[PDB]
Amino acid sequence: QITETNVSEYYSNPIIATKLSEMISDQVKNNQFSTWRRDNTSLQGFNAFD
Amino acid sequence: PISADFSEVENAPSFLSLAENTDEVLKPYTGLEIQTIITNIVGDANPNQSRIFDQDRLRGNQYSAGGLVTQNAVSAIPFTNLIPRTIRVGNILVNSANRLQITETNVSEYYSNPIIATKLSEMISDQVKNNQFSTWRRDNTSLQGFNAFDIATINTAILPNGLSLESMLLKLSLLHSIKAMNVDAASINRSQYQVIDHNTVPTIGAPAVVGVNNSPVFGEDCGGNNPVYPFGGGTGAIAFHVTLQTVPDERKSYAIFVPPAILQATSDANEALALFALSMSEWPHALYTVTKQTTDLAGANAGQQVFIPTQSTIHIGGRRVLDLIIPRREIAPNPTTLVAANAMCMVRPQAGPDATAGAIPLAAGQLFNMNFIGAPAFEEWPMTSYLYSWAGRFDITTIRQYMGRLATMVGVKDAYWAAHELNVALSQVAPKMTTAAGGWAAQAANSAQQSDVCYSSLLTVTRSAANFPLANQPAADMRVYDTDPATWNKVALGLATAANLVPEQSMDVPFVVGDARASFWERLQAIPMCIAWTMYYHSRGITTLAWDNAYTDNTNKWLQKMVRNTFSTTQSVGTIIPARYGKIVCNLYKNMFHRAPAYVATSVGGKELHITHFERWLPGGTYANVYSGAGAVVNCFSPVLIPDIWCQYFTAKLPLFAGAFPPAQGQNSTKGFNSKQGLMIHRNQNNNLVAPYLEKFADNSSYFPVGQGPEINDMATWNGRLWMTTGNVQYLDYSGAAIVEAVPPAGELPVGKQIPLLAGENAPIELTNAATTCVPRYSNDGRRIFTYLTTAQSVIPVQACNRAANLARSCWLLSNVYAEPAVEDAFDTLTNSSFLDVAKSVAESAGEVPATKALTDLQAVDVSSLPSTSDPSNVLSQPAPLMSPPT
Amino acid sequence: ANAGQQVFIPTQSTIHIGGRRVLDLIIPRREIAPNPTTLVAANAMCMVRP
Structure with a gap:
């Protein structure tokens, strides 16, 4: 027996x-993000440029 | 409506009253x-229960002029069709000697709403x-799984x-009309198979079989199992794609x-x-074929008889090669x-369930x-064969469901009803009339005259001249x-909208779609169209030969304007304009039937004009005439195609010149009009x-002055009919000389087609089944036409115009009733409220989503x-939006 | 009777505009680097x- 399904997209909510973004x-x-260094990262572990 | 007394015909509306716009x-x-x-x-009923196989005739008692019933x-x-x-x-089925009918369409872009x-674009x-501030290639969301670059290209440079x-x-409606034939015989009229071949009798016991590319004669199997286009003679190509990038650059x-x-x-x-x-x-992609079991008049011989539907012969030029871009299953590289x-x-x-041969x-x-x-x-496939393989599998109920899903994206109710109107106007067709003294006639079997035919517009259909x-x-x-x-691409995805493209709260299609009763109804919708066109042509006295040469004629100048304004050959500000006099026929239809024809819009600088099917014909065809009993053509008459009982028994209001002759009622029978109406008798x-009482200008013209033609008078046309309806008239000149046009053998009038009878039926008598209203007045060379009697034959009719005497005429024994223009399920009552609000929300759904500009603004680097x-965004101005204005 | 390929020169192709024979293009750096x-x-x- 087999089953199949179609995707839809979610515009609700x-x-x-956030204030951060x-x-x-x-x-x-105000800048061009020029203040930041090559190696700056958040506590999460991703660099700021990303 | 049928007159009961002369008081009713005398008080009928004038022609100018009914041609006023309403x-x-x-x-x-x-x-x-x-x-x-x-x-x-x-009321609504199962077509199979009703046996509408036998419901295909006007029926009723008739009264004769001699007094028998x-x-x-x-x-x-x-x-x-x-x-x-x-x-x-000879009671034996045999092949056709005549080439097939064909139609051609003009297809062009025009301004609409x-x-x-939309908000979404x-x-x-x-x-x-907002992306442009970054180093990252992901510009926008990729709608419904299509590649985001493709949404970027589709969302650019819109046409106005x-x-x-x-x-x-x-x-889609042509194909629905063709597959509609495939239902059981109890729901299709017998008469539909014997409008042209009156010697054949279809059997009720089996459904007709619809197929593709089968015809025995003149190379009409367009390749057979190796299909080619009926018109182009080529083959297409079709290719499928996931993204636009794989589409070859040439297209x-x-x-x-x-x-x-x-x-x-x-x-x-x-x-x-x-x-x-x-x-x-492009359409047709193939010639479809209807095959029906039939038998001889005695019911002896039996066989499978072959027919070509008219819908399968009418050409609508489109693309031959094409490229479709299939929706993706998930966003992905x-x-x-x-x-x-x-x-x-x-x-x-x-491919569909039907194998094909040839290359690929x-x-x-x-x-x-x-x-x-x-x-x-x-990779790609020939398209004619791909459409060939699925051709035998399409049917009415699936087209209905498809069209219903299509309904939820875009408005398709009015647009479909208009295209359906055009379907009926190009497809229903009648054979030319035969002159006679009596009630019935037909041309010889398997002859050119038997198959010569015409539109509801009184124009003949052209034939093929080669295989x-x-x-x-x-x-x-x-x-x-x-x-x-x-613009289809922009609208299908929700990037754009217009007033004609709005989804409708019905979320549903016209009643004709998905019914097995559709063929019968389409057959019945052509009637009003002819009633209005024949009133149009018979209000004036021009003969068929004069129409037939009118466009280029330099004998008279009025005849040229007259021909030229009946067709659509004007444009303005980039868009099509309706024929100037087609509006008159449109006006007549509304005043006579109390209904409105379907119409499309055209925008002229932004103003909307309506266009009905009456206003979009093109010049070049030949007008309908009638044949003699021997098959010789007769030119003398105005164009005609149907008997006038159809005209006068299905109207709410009718012009005075066209009414029926009233029934005998003791002393009083029929009556005319005289000098007290402002008329005068003509003598030479x-x-x-x-000749009868006629308009006073008739005394001072034998040739119409250049720049002028015969006028509307209803009473003079009436006396013209009274003269013709005697069995011995002369169609002549002011001086009594012969006119250039061919005239019928003496005393004859055109009459409707013969079909075989059912037990208990009688054939129509006398002039009870004839056109009468076709009174000639304008000769091809510019002469007036008169109807003459000899003096002795003249006396009773003249006194009848004076209302001292009475004329004897046949009539139908029928009454007048004209109906008013006019279902919830228990589940529908259960859900009616929710349907009422959701339907209201869909009307504004557009390209709308709940997110507003005010939310998206917060996510931006710079709002300004x-x-x-x-x-x-603004609605585009027409023909063009302003570009480089002087500051 | 006599089919064959045939050559045409577009009028747009022959109009003379500009004079900048040589150029230098500065291109974005995807990483924050010296x-x-x-x-x-x-x-x-x-x-x-x-």
């Missing part, structure tokens, strides 16, 4: 930006 | 208006502009035309995305793909290998190998709108010739730089 | 190599 985009506007 | 809104002519009168059915008299329905391909001769970009452009969807819906501008709103069914999705492929390529491509399809295309043979059920990046060899495929092309008969692939140098802030 | 000193560093450094 659109996301809201808003301050980062703000820094992109 | 302002009120009106319901569509569904054809049930005739069904209530000529049939048993009163005939019972169960009959008149046939004039129209049909079937062209016989084998014919009975103004269009506008403003979203996509905001995504690109709007979108039509008309040619698509036509092809990337022509590609069509296939929306996934269709293909949502558990079954019949690959079939939906084939059907969608059919609705956007484009395939680099074959298996990755085959695994990724949402619906994987395959197709096995039944054969699957397609998807194209992919870096592929060693591009199929046709090396060359006929002049176009009518012009339709085309559907552009680019010859004392043994007399957003194109949505600096370019809020 | 200016390259070797060849391989410069190759790896670019947003997409020409």
